[PDB]
Structure formats: C-alpha cells, structure tokens
Design an enzyme around this catalytic site. Structure first.
Site, PDB file in Angstrom:
ATOM      1  N   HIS B 350     -35.699  -9.253 -48.122  1.00 17.58           N
ATOM      2  CA  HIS B 350     -36.563  -9.500 -46.946  1.00 17.58           C
ATOM      3  C   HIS B 350     -37.902  -8.963 -47.320  1.00 17.58           C
ATOM      4  O   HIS B 350     -38.840  -8.860 -46.450  1.00 17.58           O
ATOM      5  CB  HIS B 350     -35.877  -8.996 -45.591  1.00 17.58           C
ATOM      6  N   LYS B 541     -45.910  -8.622 -32.782  1.00 16.27           N
ATOM      7  CA  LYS B 541     -45.042  -8.266 -33.887  1.00 16.27           C
ATOM      8  C   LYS B 541     -45.225  -6.984 -34.116  1.00 16.27           C
ATOM      9  O   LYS B 541     -46.015  -5.988 -33.576  1.00 16.27           O
ATOM     10  CB  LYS B 541     -45.536  -8.835 -35.177  1.00 16.27           C
ATOM     11  N   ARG B 542     -44.273  -6.236 -34.785  1.00 12.45           N
ATOM     12  CA  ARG B 542     -44.345  -4.744 -35.342  1.00 12.45           C
ATOM     13  C   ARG B 542     -45.657  -4.300 -35.816  1.00 12.45           C
ATOM     14  O   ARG B 542     -46.352  -5.145 -36.502  1.00 12.45           O
ATOM     15  CB  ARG B 542     -43.164  -4.256 -36.119  1.00 12.45           C
ATOM     16  N   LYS B 547     -49.681  -6.181 -41.887  1.00 18.15           N
ATOM     17  CA  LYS B 547     -49.703  -7.417 -40.533  1.00 18.15           C
ATOM     18  C   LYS B 547     -51.329  -7.490 -40.262  1.00 18.15           C
ATOM     19  O   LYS B 547     -51.498  -8.282 -39.515  1.00 18.15           O
ATOM     20  CB  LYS B 547     -48.739  -6.901 -39.492  1.00 18.15           C
ATOM     21  N   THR B 649     -41.171 -14.987 -38.694  1.00 19.53           N
ATOM     22  CA  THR B 649     -40.500 -15.768 -37.683  1.00 19.53           C
ATOM     23  C   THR B 649     -41.155 -16.084 -36.548  1.00 19.53           C
ATOM     24  O   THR B 649     -41.183 -17.188 -35.765  1.00 19.53           O
ATOM     25  CB  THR B 649     -38.770 -15.593 -37.884  1.00 19.53           C
ATOM     26  N   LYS B 653     -41.748 -19.721 -33.952  1.00 23.29           N
ATOM     27  CA  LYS B 653     -41.794 -19.404 -32.512  1.00 23.29           C
ATOM     28  C   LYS B 653     -43.025 -20.367 -31.927  1.00 23.29           C
ATOM     29  O   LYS B 653     -42.848 -21.016 -31.022  1.00 23.29           O
ATOM     30  CB  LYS B 653     -41.529 -18.168 -31.914  1.00 23.29           C
TER      31      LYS B 653
HETATM   32  O1  LIG Z   1     -36.456 -12.466 -43.064  1.00 27.75           O
HETATM   33  C1  LIG Z   1     -36.561 -11.689 -41.779  1.00 27.75           C
HETATM   34  C2  LIG Z   1     -38.021 -11.023 -41.877  1.00 27.75           C
HETATM   35  O2  LIG Z   1     -37.553  -9.846 -42.428  1.00 27.75           O
HETATM   36  C3  LIG Z   1     -38.687  -8.940 -42.223  1.00 27.75           C
HETATM   37  N1  LIG Z   1     -38.139  -7.624 -42.788  1.00 27.75           N
HETATM   38  C4  LIG Z   1     -37.832  -6.661 -42.083  1.00 27.75           C
HETATM   39  S1  LIG Z   1     -37.969  -6.508 -40.282  1.00 27.75           S
HETATM   40  N2  LIG Z   1     -37.303  -5.636 -42.645  1.00 27.75           N
HETATM   41  N3  LIG Z   1     -36.710  -4.487 -42.128  1.00 27.75           N
HETATM   42  C5  LIG Z   1     -36.272  -3.649 -43.082  1.00 27.75           C
HETATM   43  C6  LIG Z   1     -35.834  -2.355 -42.533  1.00 27.75           C
HETATM   44  C7  LIG Z   1     -35.252  -2.390 -41.371  1.00 27.75           C
HETATM   45  C8  LIG Z   1     -34.815  -1.095 -40.865  1.00 27.75           C
HETATM   46  C9  LIG Z   1     -35.032  -0.051 -41.768  1.00 27.75           C
HETATM   47  C10 LIG Z   1     -35.431  -0.040 -43.016  1.00 27.75           C
HETATM   48  C11 LIG Z   1     -35.920  -1.369 -43.265  1.00 27.75           C
HETATM   49 CL1  LIG Z   1     -36.816  -1.455 -44.887  1.00 27.75          CL
HETATM   50  C12 LIG Z   1     -40.043  -9.439 -43.125  1.00 27.75           C
HETATM   51  O3  LIG Z   1     -40.888  -8.570 -43.087  1.00 27.75           O
HETATM   52  C13 LIG Z   1     -40.352 -10.768 -42.382  1.00 27.75           C
HETATM   53  O4  LIG Z   1     -41.212 -11.578 -43.439  1.00 27.75           O
HETATM   54  C14 LIG Z   1     -39.191 -11.738 -42.298  1.00 27.75           C
HETATM   55  O5  LIG Z   1     -39.669 -12.849 -41.570  1.00 27.75           O
END
Ligand SMILES: OC[C@H]1O[C@@H](NC(=S)N/N=C/c2ccccc2Cl)[C@H](O)[C@@H](O)[C@@H]1O
Ligand SMILES: OC[C@H]1O[C@@H](NC(=S)N/N=C/c2ccccc2Cl)[C@H](O)[C@@H](O)[C@@H]1O
Ligand SMILES: OC[C@H]1O[C@@H](NC(=S)N/N=C/c2ccccc2Cl)[C@H](O)[C@@H](O)[C@@H]1O
Ligand SMILES: OC[C@H]1O[C@@H](NC(=S)N/N=C/c2ccccc2Cl)[C@H](O)[C@@H](O)[C@@H]1O
Lengths: 809, 809
Positions: B350, B541-542, B547, B649, B653
């Site tokens: 991801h 978004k976060r 971002k 994502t 939406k």
């Molecule tokens: O595929 C779904 C989405 O995934 C997101 N990844 C995320 S929220 N990771 N969190 C990683 C994370 C979460 C908790 C603790 C440590 C980590 Cl290291 C991507 O940034 C998006 O571009 C994508 O649309």
C-alpha cells in the site's frame, strides 16, 4: 414434582419453551446443532429475566408515585451467589421451568451449575447484605443496595500439595445476564486537589476526576411482585484523561483500578490507599444519586425521606461527605447540616477485634481527601466540646473518645466518627451489643445511651431453606402449609409433631437423601469417596484463629489416637469436613489449611481406621458450595472463643437445615440455645466471664499441656513430624503459637470440647432421639429469619412500616 | 418515500413497530416515559439485528455443507464507520424502518446520529478492508475478515486555539449491539520463552500466555441473503496470571494492553514492542482458527481450501507462523511446508514511502519471538541460495534482496519476507504496481516476474452512493433501474442522458440539496456559517506532507491576495474545506492544521472579502463525516506529488457523488482520467517522469521563489507574521521546510495548480456545462467499484469464482 416449587400450567410451560427457543436463536445466535451447555444456561437466564421486567418497572414507578421514605444500604460487599434459581423461587417459576426444560430435553439442575457465583464479598458481612436485600424486597420496603461492581470478586481457592493457591475470579468473563448498565446516570467522583477559602465558604479545587458508572441488578421479593434495585458502581476514566499518546491511553487503567478487585481480608484492617479510594468512590457516587433522587420528589425533610445504613465503617466517609455537600455546595449552616446528617445515618458494627477496626493515617486523608479531613477535625472539636461539658475535668475521657488518635502516626478512628455522626448504633447479636456498651464503646454509651441498640442477625429462608433444601421445605409444607416461607415463626407449629412417627421418618429420610446427594457430588467433581452412613461433622467459614478450626483439628487427632490405641472398640463413624478461604497475607491461616490436609493424609490412608474416620478439606467454600453442604450436615461446629464471634450466620443456616450444633456461648449461639432450649444444644467451654477471669490472672497454656496427657501426645506428634515426615519441623509455628502466644485459648476449652463431642456421638447412636432433637431445633429457628431482623431495623431505626401486601401482577 | 430504499409493506411495518416496543421493554428495561434518545437508537438496532440472525446461521451452515475455498483477509485495521443504515440498506429495510419509526413518533435520521463509528482504522488502508468485506459478501464469497478489537479506535480530534487535541475514542462505552462474543473459541497466544532442540525437532518453551477471545460481527451482502463474519480478537489474561495478591490481579492489565489501542500512524513505521505484540497476536490466533476450521472439513489440500490475504506487511508474521505450525507441530518437512505456505499467502503493498516500510530490529524478535527469528533466518538462507543460482556473482543483488538488513542495528525487512513467502504480490493502482516492478522491488520482479500483479482499488457503491446519497441514487434509478447498485458498470448508460435537460436539472438539484443539508449541518452542530451558492472546494484525508494540503493553502492565500489587490472585480465564490487528522507525533502535520485555521482566522473576518471566500477546517474527519461532506462537494482536491499516493480511494468517492476532480497524475487519478476522458478532468503538474528529472539535477525551491512574485509575497506574509500577529515566527518551520528541505516539491507545481484552478472557476460560471462534465464523470465511475476489484482478486489470486446468486431467504 414438589408442591412448594409452584405450578406447571400448560400455557406457562408452552410460553417458556417458546421464549427459550427465541433467545437461543435471536439472542445467542445459535441453533440446537452448535449450542453449548453454557448457551442453554444463558437462554434460560434470559427467559427467566424477561419475567422480572414489568414488575421492576412498576415497582420503581410505584415508589415515584407514592414517595415513601427510601432506605439506602451502603456496603462494600454484597455476597450474592447465583441468581437463576433464586429468581425462579421468588417468581414461583421453578416447576414450570423444570418442566419446560425437561420437554426440551435438558436437565435444569445441570444448567444451574453453569452460572458463576457473584462473589462480591468475603464472608458473613457480605452475605448479610445479600440476605437483607432479599428480606427488604419481601417486606415491601423502598430499599436500594449500593456497592462496587468489582471486576474480580473473592479469589477461587485451589489446593496444591495441601497449600492454598489463589486464582483470579474472572466472574464477568462470559457476561452477566442479571445486570443492566445505566450509562445515563454516570456521575463524577473527585480525588486529591486542595482546599481554597473564599468570602463565601471553602472550595475543593484542582481535583482528579474518576467517573462512576452504575449497573442495576433486580432484587425480587418473595411472590409479592416487588422488584428492588441493587446499584453497583464501576470506575471509568474521563476521555480527556492524561490528554505520549499511546501511554496516556494505557494509563486510563490507573483510574479504572478502583473497581478492579475486592480486598480479600475478613476481620482485618489494611491501610492501603487503593482501599480508601474504593470507600470514597462508593460513598461519593451514592450520595449524589441519593440527593438527585430526593430533589426530584429544602433539606429539613431529608431525614424523613432518606435513611442511610452504614454496613460497618467501610462507608463511614458518607458522614463527612454529606456534611461537605450540605455545607459547601448547598450552603446550609453547620448546625443544621449536622442535624440532618445525624438523623439520616445509622451505623452497624460487625466486630470487636482491635486489628479489624479502621484507623486511617491522617497523611493519607490529607493528600487524597483534604476537605474531608478538615470536616472531620471540625466534627471532632464540636463532639469533644460536648464530652467536656458532660464530664468536666475528665481529661482521659477526652483522649479516649477523640476521633483523632495520637501516636507515631496520627490516625482517624472511623468507628468513633460513625458513632458521633449516627442517630443509631447497633451490634448484631444480644451478647455482642452488650459487649459494645460495656467495653469497646463504653464512653460513648455513657454520653448517649439512647443511640445503642441490638439487631440480632438473620438469614433468608428463601435461599437457605426453599432453594437449597426443597425436600425439607416440602415435608414441612405438607403439615403446616407454605405461609412459613415468609413468616418463619410458624415453624413453631412443628413442635406438635415431635412425637409423630411419620414426621420423624420423613425428617431423617430428607437428611439421608441430602447426604447421599453430597457424597455423590464429592466423588463426581473431586474423585473423593466417603461413607454416607457416618456422622457428617462440618465446620465451614473463613479461616481465622478466633474461629478455632485448630480446636477442631485437636479433636480429630484425639479420635485418631483413641482408635489407634484400641482398634477393635466400636466408635461412631465420622466424616469431618472443614472448608473456608484464608486471606492471602494471613500466614497462620494458611498453615492451618496445610495442617488440616496433612491430618487427612495420615488419617484417610490408615488401614486400621478403615471408614470409621475421614477428614476432608472442602476446597473453594463459597455461597454455591454452602447451599450443597449445609443441607447435608449432621453436626454444625460453632466453636469460636467466647466474646470473639459478633454473631455468626452460618450457625443459623445449619439450624434451619436439620443439623445439631456444638458451640460455645458466643455471638448468636446464645440466642439459638435460648430459643431451642439448652437441652437441645451441645454447649461447652468458657463463657465470656470465664475468659475475662483467665485474662486477669494470665493464660498459661503450659498448665494444660502438663495435666492433659492426651493433649501432650498431640503436641508431641505435631512437633516431632508425625504429620509431616519429610519436613519434620513444618508445624513449628503452630506449636509455638499454641504454647506461648495463643490469644484464643485453644487449650483451655480442649477438655470440655472432647467430652461434649462424646455426648454427640452417644446421641447419634440413637437415630430416633437424634431426629427428635433436630425437630426441636428446626421448629425454634423462626427468630433467625432476616425478615424479623429487617422488620426491627425498619421500625426501630429507619422509621418505616413493613408491608406483606402484593403489588398488581 | 424514495424507491431504492425498498418497500414499506403493512405487515412489515406492523412487525417492526411490535419488535421495537418489545426491545425497548424486555431488552432495554424502559418505557416511553423514561426512554432517552439513545435508548430508542438501541431498540431500533436490536430490531434490525434480529433480521440478520437466520441469514447469518444459514450462510455459515451453507459454507460447512458446500466446503468452498475460504478467503481469510488479515488486517490490523477495519475502518467500518456506523452499521445501522448499512444493515438496513443491504436488507432492503430502510423505508419500512423509516415508516415504523415515523408512526412511533420518532425521526430515524436523528436516531442514526447516535451510533458511534467503529473507528478501527487510520484512513485508506483501513477503509479498503471495510469496502472489501462488503463486496466479498455481495459477491457470495466464503470470506472472513480477521483483526483486533481495539478498545480505543482512532482518537477523536478536537481543535483548540487552532491546534489539534486528541481524546480517547471510547467507542464501546455504551456497548456494541453489532458484535457477539464467542468465548468458546478462545485460543492461547504465546510470547517470549526460548527454543529447545530435541531428537525430533525444535520446541518453543517457557512462554508467557495471553488469551485471544473472538467477537463476531455480521457482514451482510447486498440483498442476496449472504451474511459473512468479521472476527476480531480481544486480549485476555489467563486466571493464574502472576499467581502480592492485589498487585498480581492489577497486573493483568499488562497482558490485556495488547488490544487496548489502535496505533494512529498513517504511512509511518514506529518500531514499538507493543505494536509487534499486536501483529503477532492477530496472526497467531487467526492461524489456529483457520487450521481448526480446515481440519473439520493432510496439508497438500490446504491451499485448495485456504487463501490468506495480507493487508500490507502488518500481518507478515503469518508466513513464519504458518511454517512454525507446519514444521514444529504437524511435523511436515521444510520444503513441503514451504510449498503450502507460498501457495496459501498473498501480499498487497500500500505504499512506496521508505519511512512507512516495516523493518523490525532483530533484538526485538529475538526476545519476543525466538522461534520465528530462527525460521526467518532459514527462509532467508534458502531464498538467497536461489538468487545466487539465478544471478551468479552478483554480490550486491544478494545484499539488496536479503530479508536481513545490515547496519548499526540489524533489521528484518518485512516486505522482503512477504514477497519471498507469497505466490502473488500486488499494488493498488496501475501506476503504483508499475513503480513496484521498476524501482522498489525491481530485483524481486527480475527473479519472479509471475508473482507481480495489479489490483486497482475500489469503493463500495452501497455505502458510498445509496447510503450517503439517496437523492442521486434515486434520479439514476429512475432512468436505468436499480441493477447498477451491484453492477456499477451500468452507469455507462447515463452517457445517453448527457444532453437530457431533465436529467441535467435533476443532477444539479440533488447537488444543491446536498450542499444545503451540509450548510445546515455546519451551523447546527458547529455554529459556523457558509454561502451554499459558492463552489464547495474540498480536501479531506489524513494530514501528510505528501498529500500537499500545503499546496492547497498556497492557492487559498493567492485568492485572498488577488481579492485584496482588486476588491471590486468579480470572482467565483468559494468555500474551501480542509479536514483530516494528524498522527499525534507528527509535528509538521500539526503545524499544517494550525496554518489552515490561522488562514481561516484572517480570511473569514476580512470585511472586503465578504462571502466570496471562506476557509473552514473540518474537525474530526472520519467515516460518518465523509458520508456527509462527499455528497456536498463540487471540487475534489487530489493533489499528491506524482509517485507518492499509491492509489487513493477518497478520489473515487467524490467521482461517484458528482464532484469534479483537480489532481495530479498520481495513483488511481490516472485511471480515473482515462475512464472519464482527460477533457473531463482538471489535470495539472509534474508527471512521475518530471519528478525524476528534477531529482536528478536537484530540486532548488529558491528558483521558484525568485521568479514567481505571487509566491514570494505569500512566503513573506508567512515569515513576517501576517497570519500570526502575536507570534510572528510561529510558521518559521513551515517556511524553512518549503525553502530548504521539501521532499514533495510544493513550489514546483504551484504555477500549474493556480492556472488549473482558474479553469475550474471558469467552468463553474457555466452551470449547464459544469453539470454535463459531472454527468460524464459519474457515468464512467463504474470501474472503481470494489465489486470489480474483488472479482479480480478472486479470479487472479484466490482461485475462486464470484456468484451473484441469492441464498434462500
Ligand atoms: O490501498 C488503500 C490506501 O492505502 C493507503 N495506505 C495507508 S493508509 N497505509 N497505512 C499504513 C500504516 C497504517 C498504520 C500503521 C503504520 C502504517 Cl505504515 C495509501 O496511502 C493509499 O494511496 C491507498 O489508497
Ligand atoms: O448480556 C450481557 C450484557 O447485558 C446488558 N443487559 C441488557 S442489554 N439488558 N438487560 C436486561 C435485564 C437485566 C437484568 C434483569 C432483567 C433484564 Cl430484562 C448489560 O447492560 C451489560 O452490562 C452486560 O454485559
Ligand atoms: O454481622 C455479619 C457477620 O459479620 C462478620 N464480620 C465480617 S465478615 N467482617 N468483615 C470485615 C472486613 C471485611 C473486609 C475488609 C476488612 C474487614 Cl475488617 C462477623 O465476624 C460475624 O460474627 C457476623 O455474623
Ligand atoms: O449488547 C452488548 C453486548 O451484546 C452481546 N451480544 C449478544 S448477547 N447478542 N448478540 C446478538 C447479535 C449480535 C450481532 C448481530 C446480531 C445479533 Cl442477534 C455481546 O456478546 C457483548 O460483547 C456486548 O457487550
């Protein structure tokens, strides 16, 4: 199958079956293919609890409409046991549920065994609160039990190599179907901080906040459609608590620890901060709830609408907390606030042992509850001014009566606080209440004699006869009807059956059946085997030096030594059963458990003894176990040193269930003997006066050792390692205590005890006469119903009339 | 009232009303006199959940009878949001419940607002798991979501003085009506200990034990009567744990802390022991559950009956845990165990940001999981032997590909572990999957090209259209029927309505209504006022530097400066809304939030601006808030530096709900533009190749500052204290980062972004043409249904066929 268990009508049975199946499906999300026996228990519990709902809602709305005086019973302990059978009994649903489950292919008794005890108490004090709740509901009083919802109750006791091991009583693991969380009545409780003085009064500021969340449990009256509430508080952290981030969230545990665990000390005071927090937590939340309810009806009328009963000194902070709210928050003048407080509060004392009295260090109250300390100092000053005016120049009286104790660490005497701030103070049996006036609180009695009362303890005949001994309840009902279940004095009618040969047979038969059932329970769940024809000699209660399980041990060894001396003489066979938990930090009590099991190890495997003597330690004694063993007992051991057991309640349970009593003239034993007749009781030993006389000249155990050769032999067996061959010195602490520092004079009652035990054996040889004496005990047990006890509290302390009338069904 | 919400039949409405009243009485123990609005919510939740039961039982028994291949989706995050409306939607109960509650005198929408979000995730990765569960159930797959039941989910964000404050998300406070505890499937999980070698294998001994207790939540498919399970594990101490006494009981918290709180880091790795314990906890309990279920059907058949999908590397310990169980416990040979493991497991990546990759220190695994470390070393040795044989003499390849990273502290690269031990590895959008093959995992792709796949992300059109935007769903259904709800490609039919004047009007009307509703929500619950005629410009978004909320901030200040320069020229009015949480330890993200609110403080109170520009920070962005704001948006800001957002994502939406997109060619934006046509998308900025070119010659932000006078002004306003008059240097860190250490090249995209924003303003001046472009976006959003995504996983990775067929009702 039996009459006192109610009707099994076709419509009711059909409805129960339907609702059972509904809960299994819609509530538990199971079908009959996957359902565990635990699932079936829950389906039944939900089915039964459904029947409480309408009555619970209408009872509480009835109190709202009628606005009677409310009774608030504050306790840190409510030893409830199981709830399923009790609820069926009080709702007259037992036979209908038995039938409904039978038709579904299930054994109800087996489902009942799945329920966890609510073990939120240590022993007598906690179980008294529970019997009281039952009686208050049965007597139609507007009563509320208020306490703490401990996540962990009294520990489960395991015996490993003859030693007690403790494990956590995770009683909420599977969820509790008998509680309803009430998050909307969540209240804040304050700790620490500091006191600020302004133009218009003191203010308590910079406090830490813990939330008190209530859980309500229904308390059904016996077939009167009354359902009262027991409200237990659980500790919750506020959401901004400690608010790096992860640690702050994990630290919420520190606040929530307040309601985590029941302190497992019986009759012993430990001055630990967490315990003090628990005591204030229950008091602060309860009082806000009380005041809120009162405002939804001017504080002159407060004592006409509110009674607060303090179960020992554990909730004694109610007194300064009520003052705090009245003075600081409501802005009443001190003297009016005080008048209200005194008229509202009453105090029940449960012990005279000095090590059990709560004496909180001043520095602890200073830090945790700074405003309450100030209020306590002010109470003390005004009280001592009154003492000085009544007894001018008596300077030692002033120091004796002070709420503040001087010494190395200054302490607050919580019992003195309770007396000063209550309109009534009671002991729990006639002899105990007399001892309070004559010794412990003599000074207070001289100042305010009108405050001091007696309220002899009682037990509920619902749990302690109908529920645990349906067979006995039935043979009684066949002759005198079933009115006695809520009017226990009617058991006197049984005196005209003492010569009835059918009744004699039936009484003896029910006892035999109970003993067979208990003998079977022991084999099945503990792989231990016993002779059901033997005399069942039972001592069950918490392990304490004052309760003298050790005296019982000496008798057991005496019988063993006599058998070994003359193997071929006849002796009445005995099964001696001892059970009870020891407080985890009480070394001597742990050693006594080890001694008992060690005696069992020698006695139970001696070929010469055969099945003539067996010694069994009953593991994990608790309310559910008591319901099994008490109906099975022949002999009840109530053998505390005279003047030490305030009342006892275990004694009363045995009396009601057809055991004869061997006991000292201590606590309620005195009143039991008086009711039954001394000829129908096995009394031995020093009276209180004899103990006093011995203390004056000094107790020398060596004297007894020197002139009783049978006692000498036992001490030498203990010392030399007869009962611990691999660790010969294992019991040295026990021997040394007995010989040099025995506060409870075990040796002094030894000779009389053994001789009295011979008289018991003699009577048991004559079944017909044994049973006639039993009938005379059961027939005179009426005084010991907690319905009588509660009726006396109601009339003489709370100022309210009990009612036997039923509410609309 | 609207068609897609289902039928409101007279029998169903009557039944719902009856069951609502039953739950209020028998479940909640209330009547209409005392019932709180929260009580009414619970009565409705219980009424709706009743309808899940039969379907849930029959679905699971169906899987038992048919024994299909089971799919196990392992994730540390499941960002579920609220459950009530979603359950009604999928069961076709919404209109019937709306009617039933209306007739009871209640507003259902108001009751819906009472439910807590299940906030068990951080952002995109967690929400993806949730959309996936919905699609798997809708596609009739035998699928199970496995995770952790955190007591505290993502923190609630409060804004205080423009700064983020975190508070604990105590989401279980009132109880969760959507879970069923399953204590009978409680399993032990092992930690610490040591490895012992015997004649027949290694043994892991002297471990500490934590119990894993499962809670099951139903996952209903869309109107197909399928109900799958999400099983979440909760940590419980064993009863003999630490078993002076009081402390041992209080110390149970240490074991139970494992499931206490969700780590609030999005795209950032923190090597904390508690996090590692969480990762093993979920893996160990899940795998035992899987194996148990498989045995109740020889491990050759294991991969034919089991697929395990790893959601990022967080559950990567599944690989060595499966090996451990197969080798140590089942006694399979290494090579056969390995074959089974590889065929069973698949891995989804991801992110490409290096700081987000999990690299666990060896010393941590050594202490906590000694046997797993040994297994990992052995995996690495055998893998590197294969690399050496394929690329003889390439010694740098060996170090690059090793699972063991050398350095100051030795670390395990969990992504390398996942690739070695999985038969499939996928990225989450076409450009992201290409980047994986070309850069990050280039070496692995050269060794095993067949392993690498793409599965472009999707969103569920149930929650993200029907639930949150019923008005839009309805005007669509009026024209093309309602089949598109589970076959989103049918939205292409809307292309023949792009010139339909009635449809144009209806689309624009629904947007207007949504904006009015959201404008009203803002006033009522935040006392903030906005012009509903303005363009709603939304970035939610976060908060992350990648971002580029900062780029958005620069545009906002640009518009403000232009207005101030020429106050009397016409500009298209905007409401600029930015929302999102910052990870608690991420200083720069917290500063960005403060900047946004500080810009709002200047812009929103400038009399010259009027209602032409408003800047609002949306507090506590979460799934429930997204359901409100997304339908209201006109412009979707998707402006990450090219090559940094793996997919996105949120983008999808907005597209589905009638907003136009301004975005870089990053993540799924590329595929969105390709589906809709580049003419129907507002694309700007560097492509990935442009970023690469800039990196080669070196990024000099000063160059941009020097040649763009409008940019220079903004930096000087920031630096001099224009946006923080009382603390003039407040934003110094931000300026210094932008000028000297910006990894994300904010300045480089500034000019193109501003010009593109002018083109957006131009189109919004022409409502008819704005709306026609919207219609072209909605009509081509079909590809982005998670039903499509899941169908591809099923066919290309799991080896199972989806089914649209319904189970018996
Ligand atoms: O595929 C779904 C989405 O995934 C997101 N990844 C995320 S929220 N990771 N969190 C990683 C994370 C979460 C908790 C603790 C440590 C980590 Cl290291 C991507 O940034 C998006 O571009 C994508 O649309
Ligand atoms: O089943 C376990 C859960 O049950 C909940 N009880 C609910 S929802 N209703 N109770 C109704 C009730 C309760 C007591 C008597 C009669 C009734 Cl009719 C408790 O609030 C929780 O704290 C507990 O964990
Ligand atoms: O009145 C009911 C019974 O009360 C008992 N008291 C008990 S269990 N006190 N526990 C005190 C206690 C309990 C917990 C912590 C500290 C203490 Cl200090 C008496 O010993 C009995 O003779 C009497 O029958
Ligand atoms: O009400 C709160 C309590 O509810 C309990 N749920 C019970 S008894 N039934 N659920 C049935 C159910 C659950 C989900 C969906 C459908 C049904 Cl039909 C949970 O086990 C507890 O962990 C929780 O605290």
């Amino acid at each position: 199958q039996i009459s006192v268990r109610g009707l099994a009508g076709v419509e009711n049975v059909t409805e129960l079956k339907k609702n059972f199946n509904r809960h299994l499906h819609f509530t538990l999300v199971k079908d009959r293919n996957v359902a565990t026996p635990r699932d079936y228990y829950f389906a039944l519990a939900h089915t039964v609890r459904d029947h409480l709902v309408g009555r619970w809602i209408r009872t509480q709305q009835h109190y709202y409409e009628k606005d009677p005086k409310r009774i608030y019973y504050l306790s840190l302990e409510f030893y409830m046991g199981r709830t399923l059978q009790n609820t069926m009994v009080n709702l007259a649903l037992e036979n209908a549920c038995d039938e409904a489950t039978y038709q579904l292919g299930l054994d109800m008794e087996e489902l009942e065994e799945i329920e966890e005890d609510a073990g939120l108490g240590n022993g007598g004090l906690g179980r008294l609160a529970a019997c009281f709740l039952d009686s208050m509901a049965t007597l139609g009083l507007a009563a509320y039990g208020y306490g703490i919802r401990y996540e962990f109750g009294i520990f489960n006791q395991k015996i490993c190599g003859g030693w007690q091991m403790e494990e956590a009583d995770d009683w909420l693991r599977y969820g509790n179907p008998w509680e309803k969380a009430r998050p909307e009545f969540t209240l804040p409780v304050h700790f620490y901080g500091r006191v600020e003085h302004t133009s218009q009064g003191a203010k308590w500021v910079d406090t830490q906040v813990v939330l008190a969340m209530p859980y309500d449990t229904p308390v059904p009256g016996y077939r009167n459609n009354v359902v009262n509430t027991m409200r237990l508080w659980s500790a919750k952290a506020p959401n901004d608590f400690n608010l790096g981030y992860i640690q702050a969230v994990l630290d919420r545990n520190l606040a929530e620890n307040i309601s985590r665990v029941l302190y497992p000390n019986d009759n012993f005071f430990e001055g630990k901060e967490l315990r003090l927090k628990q005591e204030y937590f229950v008091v602060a939340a309860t009082l806000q709830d009380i005041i809120r309810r009162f405002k939804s009806s001017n504080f002159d009328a407060f004592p006409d609408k509110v009674a607060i009963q303090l179960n020992d000194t554990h909730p004694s902070l109610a007194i300064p907390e009520l003052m705090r709210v009245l003075v600081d928050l409501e802005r009443l003048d001190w003297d009016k606030a005080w008048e209200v407080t005194v008229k509202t509060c009453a105090y029940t004392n449960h012990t005279v042992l000095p090590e059990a009295l709560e004496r909180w260090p001043v520095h602890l109250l200073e830090t945790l509850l700074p405003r309450h300390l100030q209020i306590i100092y002010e109470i003390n000053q005004r009280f001592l001014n009154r003492v000085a005016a009544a007894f001018p120049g008596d300077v030692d009286r002033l120091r004796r009566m002070s709420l503040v104790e001087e010494g190395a660490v200054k302490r607050i005497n919580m019992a003195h606080l309770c007396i000063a701030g209550s309109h009534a103070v009671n002991g729990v049996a006639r002899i105990h209440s007399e001892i309070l006036k004559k010794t412990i609180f003599k000074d207070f009695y001289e100042l305010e004699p009108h405050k001091f009362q007696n309220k002899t303890n009682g037990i509920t005949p619902r749990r302690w006869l109908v529920l645990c001994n349906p067979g006995l309840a039935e043979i009684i009902a066949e002759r005198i009807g079933e009115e006695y279940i809520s009017d226990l004095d009617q058991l006197r009618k049984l005196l005209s059956y003492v010569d009835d040969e059918a009744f004699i047979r039936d009484v003896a038969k029910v006892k035999q059946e109970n003993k067979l059932k208990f003998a079977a329970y022991l084999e099945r769940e503990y792989k231990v085997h016993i002779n059901p024809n033997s005399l069942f000699d039972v001592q069950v209660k918490r392990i304490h030096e004052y309760k003298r399980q050790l005296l019982n041990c000496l008798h057991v060894i005496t019988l063993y030594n006599r058998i070994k001396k003359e193997p071929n003489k006849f002796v009445v066979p005995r099964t001696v059963m001892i059970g009870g938990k020891a407080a985890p930090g009480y070394h001597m009590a742990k050693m006594i458990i080890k001694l008992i099991t060690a005696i069992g190890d020698v006695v139970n495997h001696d070929p010469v003894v055969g099945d003539r003597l067996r010694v069994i330690f009953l593991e994990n004694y608790r309310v559910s176990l008591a319901e099994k063993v008490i109906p099975a007992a022949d002999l009840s051991e109530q053998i505390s040193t005279a003047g030490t057991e305030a009342s006892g309640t275990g004694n009363m349970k045995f009396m009601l269930n057809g055991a004869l009593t061997i006991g000292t003239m201590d606590g309620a034993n005195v009143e039991m003997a008086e009711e039954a007749g001394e000829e129908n009781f096995f009394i031995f030993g020093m009276r209180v006066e004899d103990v006093d006389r011995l203390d004056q000249r000094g107790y020398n155990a060596q004297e007894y050792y020197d002139r009783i050769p049978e006692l000498r032999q036992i001490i030498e067996q203990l010392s030399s390692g007869f009962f611990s061959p691999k660790q010969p010195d294992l019991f040295k602490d026990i021997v040394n205590m007995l010989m040099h520092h025995d506060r409870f004079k075990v040796f002094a009652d030894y000779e009389e005890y053994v001789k009295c035990q011979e008289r018991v054996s003699a009577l048991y040889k004559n079944p017909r006469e044994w049973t006639r004496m039993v009938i005379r005990n059961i027939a005179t047990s009426g005084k010991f119903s907690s319905d009588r006890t509660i009726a006396q509290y109601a009339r003489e302390i709370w100022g309210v009339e009990p009612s036997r009338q039923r509410l609309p069904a």
